[PDB]
Design a protein around this ligand. Sequence first.
Ligand SMILES: O=C(O)[C@@H](CO)OP(=O)(O)O
Ligand SMILES: O=C(O)[C@@H](CO)OP(=O)(O)O
Ligand SMILES: [Cl-]
Ligand SMILES: [K+]
Ligand SMILES: [Mg+2]
Ligand SMILES: [Mg+2]
Ligand SMILES: [Mg+2]
Ligand SMILES: [Mg+2]
Lengths: 436, 430
Amino acid sequence: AVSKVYARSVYDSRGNPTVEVELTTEKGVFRSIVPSGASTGVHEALEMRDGDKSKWMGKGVLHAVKNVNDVIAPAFVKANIDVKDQKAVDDFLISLDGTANKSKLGANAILGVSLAASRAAAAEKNVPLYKHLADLSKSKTSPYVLPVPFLNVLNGGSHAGGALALQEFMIAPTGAKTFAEALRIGSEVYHNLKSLTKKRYGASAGNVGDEGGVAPNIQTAEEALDLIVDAIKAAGHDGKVKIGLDCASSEFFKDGKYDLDFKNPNSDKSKWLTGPQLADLYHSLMKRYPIVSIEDPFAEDDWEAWSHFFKTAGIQIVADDLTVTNPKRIATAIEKKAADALLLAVNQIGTLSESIKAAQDSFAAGWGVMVSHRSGETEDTFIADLVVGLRTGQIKTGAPARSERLAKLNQLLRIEEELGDNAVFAGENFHHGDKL
Amino acid sequence: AVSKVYARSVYDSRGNPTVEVELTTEKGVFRSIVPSGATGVHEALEMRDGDKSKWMGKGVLHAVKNVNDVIAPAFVKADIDVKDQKAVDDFLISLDGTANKSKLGANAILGVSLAASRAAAAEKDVPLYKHLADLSKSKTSPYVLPVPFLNVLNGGALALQEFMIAPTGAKTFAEALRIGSEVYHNLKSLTKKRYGASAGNVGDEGGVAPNIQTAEEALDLIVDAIKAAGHDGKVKIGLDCASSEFFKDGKYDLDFKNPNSDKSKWLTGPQLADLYHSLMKRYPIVSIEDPFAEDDWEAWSHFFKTAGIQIVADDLTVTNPKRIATAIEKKAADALLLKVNQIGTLSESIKAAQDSFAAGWGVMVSHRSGETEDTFIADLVVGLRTGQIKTGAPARSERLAKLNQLLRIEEELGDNAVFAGENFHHGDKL
Ligand SMILES: O=C(O)[C@@H](CO)OP(=O)(O)O
Ligand SMILES: O=C(O)[C@@H](CO)OP(=O)(O)O
Ligand SMILES: [Cl-]
Ligand SMILES: [K+]
Ligand SMILES: [Mg+2]
Ligand SMILES: [Mg+2]
Ligand SMILES: [Mg+2]
Ligand SMILES: [Mg+2]
């Protein structure tokens, strides 16, 4: 029985308020925290903010919290839905709000209750969270599949001060044999990268972006990718570490064009690229560097550019702002063959149930699924258990720096240990990890 | 009954491996993680593998092994009562058998020490901070909630390492944190405006690190930030000089990042003190940590004569009751920076705090620069009733995890807690 549901304000990794929910049963008190994006897709479910300029830079979540405590809480406690029944739980919450985009209560009011319920269920059942999430998703547990970590070791775009347009430069130790090995290798590459970055672009280059990657003030990707390929070599993990990009191209899509200097107020509109032109630059990058995944190469509604690029890409193409973990928009992307991987970000859609549906739909269409953090993260570790539960074989939860990232990576360490011989490391099979 | 003690490697906020310990009883499995400094020469031994081919030489396999291979079987055989933190840490301390914990390693022992206290709280069915109050014979009516010292700016051209803000003017911790976060964001905005976008990217502790020449420029910047946020008069400043970092040939080099620093312009103890006093006169500074080197006793004592604000010992005392006794003897400082992993056990850490308090000292509980998702010090600072803590800027969740835990503690305690505010120095005496 759910005796209590309670929400408070806490702080994310950028020092902005966000919603924390506590769900009390006889099994104890269960806590989930909602993350917060910076490069948020326009189609994402509502993140409700106070916009009281006198408090928290206008970023209060008092209203969201109040919606939990004054609206959802009493109705949820009164109903006492079986927490084990995630569908009915999320069913209830979504109906309480009664809008498509969760704009009545706010996604950041509902998600906390959704996630906390699933934690409570796992306890009731006497099973690890990833196990219960496996159950929820009807995923195979024999073996489990452990994810390749995609480590955003070099931050640009809206995640770091500097010229670099593309948002995330990730390394993916697919050549590793275990997660633990992959994390060691990733940390070694990161440290070697940090040293080379300082030497190459100055000590200040070694300071980190929002997601823990070094933040050199450089103008082009090709400059970023040189640093990483040099770092991989220096760490002596050549051929065992691939690269992944999040372009977050929606952040510099303007006037049907793409601004590769969008953080320059004096950017040259002459040198803004067309879809084609941009497609060209990517293909050059793909040719020169060991890139195995590219996320949001084109804009959240630039469907034609996705379709045309995907035709001849030949690597994993991840939809993020395109699909915003929305089963509706995933259906479109599948139809148009715009991508073959989904970025799963639970607070984009606002319930676990909906997030699991998006995953299941993607897998069914032969997509991959990369579970993701937000750039605004917390000490919450839910997506570590999620990626394992969902058997996706790939996650991206930050550089190996800043503990809102390490928290997830550490939790994955612990899960791999627990699972022992009943887990495989997805490694080179990350794309179709579920099919393993 | 403790039925297993176990250790694994995990990664700290800088992506370096560290020791995580799990202690198992009939109440379940209880977890503690060891932090890591970037360290006083007198600190208990942090044991690293030094295998250049692994983790940049920073592996902790040996320490983990020491937990699993040496401490673990003996501890279990010992049938220790985790409720008795003293018996716990005496066993551990005895097992290692060395003054500075160099046989098994400080980072092997501390995890067991902390996990035991978590297990003890559970057995008693009390919150951790409550158990820690009991262990330390601290008053709980009311509890005292800490002022957060937030590390918003870092140095080290400008030679001073840490520049913190302390919302002592707040009426609750919750209000303190909000005010702190607002100042921090305003400072970040001003920094990028004044020193370029890249200068907004954070350091190891989540603070900004603009290329600044002088302390004054760093303090003026912070003053502007506090004003911009509209909290002028409600927010004070704290400093961590980490002067050992620029202590050379019996002198202090304020320009110790310049290879050709004018050696003739290196300061004497009395000279540096003159600088601090000028800074202290012009800015709302209410606390200064390690203003002199970790064995420059004469320099501390001299300064302490004329200083009118809290003077914290860190590298000087390294949370060691033996060195704190000296510091008290010499009238070198009047506050202890409590870093549990500097001495290695909870019991010695509590002993250090108690010796400090008994000598009229303050105690600032503190993180290390390499932190984890572990939130022990949040419960510890409340348990010890010290009234002040420093656990990072309000960014990076190895910092926020602690400050969030304090929000929860404050909410839980309701009317049975006071915010130390202006009275942080003698918070324990509140
Ligand atoms: O774009 C992304 O993929 C996410 C995760 O890194 O970032 P943000 O939460 O800022 O949108
Ligand atoms: O000197 C200090 O005060 C500590 C905490 O800031 O730093 P470090 O853990 O690197 O010793
Ligand atoms: Cl006193
Ligand atoms: K002994
Ligand atoms: Mg985004
Ligand atoms: Mg993205
Ligand atoms: Mg130090
Ligand atoms: Mg210090």
